[PDB]
Amino acid sequence: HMKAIVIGAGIGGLSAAVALKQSGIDCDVYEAVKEIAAISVWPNGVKCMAHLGMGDIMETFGGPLRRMAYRDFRSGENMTQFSLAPLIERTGSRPCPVSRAELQREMLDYWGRDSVQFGKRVTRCEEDADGVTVWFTDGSSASGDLLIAADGSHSALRPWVLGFTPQRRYAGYVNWNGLVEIDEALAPGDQWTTFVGEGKQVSLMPVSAGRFYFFFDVPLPAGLAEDRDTLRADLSRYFAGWAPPVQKLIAALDPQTTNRIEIHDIEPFSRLVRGRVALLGDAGHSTTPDIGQGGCAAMEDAVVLGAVFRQTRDIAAALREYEAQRCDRVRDLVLKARKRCDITHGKDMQLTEAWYQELREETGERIINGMCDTILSGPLG
């Protein structure tokens, strides 16, 4: 009946395809790559997955995160440590940290790999009275009634929707991330533990199967001559003097499976749709990962997208309502992440010092309340 073309088979595209199908819309999913660390899916994200029929993925693969702590970088002592039980009670779902690999594999399995066309890199969309068409680098094309551009932070379709080409803004820090086996010599196995100091941080969080998702953050200029070959040396020098658990992590990680990402965001857009085409996921909003809401927001995007089509077939009207519901939400998330990034990574070391001070006096009430505000502001409340 109604055909949606979905570009991108990441969290966004697969969630959108699942949501559109829930609403009786047939989706063909296209993905540029020919084949193939972790994210923390907070309760708003979890509730969305559950709404989408993918609740089992979260529950099964979400690591046992039960409490959190911040530790002094030099001494390794707790500044604050507390349970997240109240977070779970107030929001109705637990936070589910999950390895990217497993999450991708499970979502693809849920949708169906044979219903995704791989090696299809979109370059262009065109809309006429009757529908929309896309072209792929391999020379092929495809037509449908609706187009979902979930093609990522470097989205090729975004400029057609906005009429100009947004540029990524370097956020001023570098993130190294990966997975290691759990060891209490590093930190507790059911805890989100972060060492903070010097505008840097080192974080450990449990995913499934007795592993930690880890990440190192260092404020630095973009473009340094660093990669997996210099990796262990880079970390050793950026985290010189840091408590023993940090040195132990640097020694346990495998540089060859560790990722180095220069963190960017994009100034928020005031538009998400044009005619039969909607931006979704990173294509429509690209945030620093500082509050862990990028993947969550893509899932939220999909829930709303599905909702607006549940009882209409007026595409332009449905997308205008999608845009109305999502635009201010994702603007706030991007900006809130940016603020958190600047505080955590020493944009103004005094504010950052002030923050460390707050962490020493922190009972968890404040942190949990802030987390709830972000979560409860999502579409499923």
Per the listing, tokens 């660390």 go with 37
Coil, strand or helix at 78: strand
Task: Return the residue of 97, 289, 346, 364 that touches Cl ion, per CB under 5 A.
Answer: 289
C-alpha 134/C-alpha 272 separation (Å) is 18
Q: Which does 54 bind (CB under 5 to 8 A by kind): Cl ion, ligand FAD, none?
A: none
Structure tokens that stand for 199 in this block: 């505008």
Name residues contacting ligand FAD, limited to 220-279 (CB under 6 A).
261
Q: Which amino acid is at 121?
A: R
Q: Binding of ligand FAD at residue 152 (CB under 6 A)?
A: yes
Measured CA angle at 337 (ends 206, 237), to 5 deg: 60
**Under a CB-based contact definition with an 8 Å cutoff, are residues 343 and 219 in contact?**
no
**Closest distance of CB 250 from ligand FAD, Å:** 18
> Cβ of residue 201: shortest distance to ligand FAD, in angstroms?
13
Q: For residues 281 and 294, what is the distance between their CA atoms, to the nearest angstrom? A: 7
352 contact, one of Cl ion, ligand FAD, none, CB 5-8 Å limit per kind: none
Find out whether 147 and 276 touch, Cβ atoms under 8 Å: yes
Residue number, 115 or 314, with CB nearest to ligand FAD: 115
124/115 Cα distance (integer angstroms):
22
Total residues contacting ligand FAD by CB under 6 A comes to 33
Residues 6+ apart with CB under 8 A from 365: none
Rounded Cα–Cα distance for residues 101 and 185 (Å): 26
Q: Least distance (Å) from ligand FAD to the CB of residue 326?
A: 13
Q: Considering only the stretches 1-9, 121-129, 232-240, 289-297, report the one whose residues sit in contact with Cl ion under the rule CB under 5 A.
A: 289-297
* Site map (CB under 6 A) of ligand FAD, residues 36-55, x = contact: ---xxx---x----------
Rounded-to-integer distance, Cα 266 and Cα 63, Å: 30
Q: Which does 191 bind (CB under 5 to 8 A by kind): ligand FAD, Cl ion, none?
A: none
Q: For residue 360, count other CB atoms closer than 10 A to its CB.
A: 11
Q: Determine how β-strand 259-265 pairs with β-strand 169-181.
A: antiparallel
CB nearer ligand FAD, residue 152 or residue 206: 152
State whether the Cα torsion 208-210-216-217 is positive or negative: positive
CB neighbourhood size of 319 (10 A): 24
Contact 166, 334 (CB under 8 A): no
Q: How far is the CB of 266 from Cl ion (least distance, A)?
A: 13
Per CB under 6 A, the segment of 86-94, 224-232, 264-272, 295-303 that binds ligand FAD is 295-303
Binding mask 315-354 for ligand FAD (x = CB under 6 A): ----------------------------------------
Partner from ligand FAD, Cl ion, none binding residue 13, C-beta < 5-8 Å depending on class: ligand FAD
266 binds, among Cl ion, ligand FAD, none (CB under 5 to 8 A by kind): none
Q: Which does 264 bind (CB under 5 to 8 A by kind): Cl ion, ligand FAD, none?
A: none
> Residues in the site for Cl ion, rule: CB under 5 A?
289, 294
> Residues in the site for ligand FAD, rule: CB under 6 A?
7-13, 30-33, 39-41, 45, 121-122, 150-152, 156, 175, 177, 261, 281-282, 289, 292-296, 298
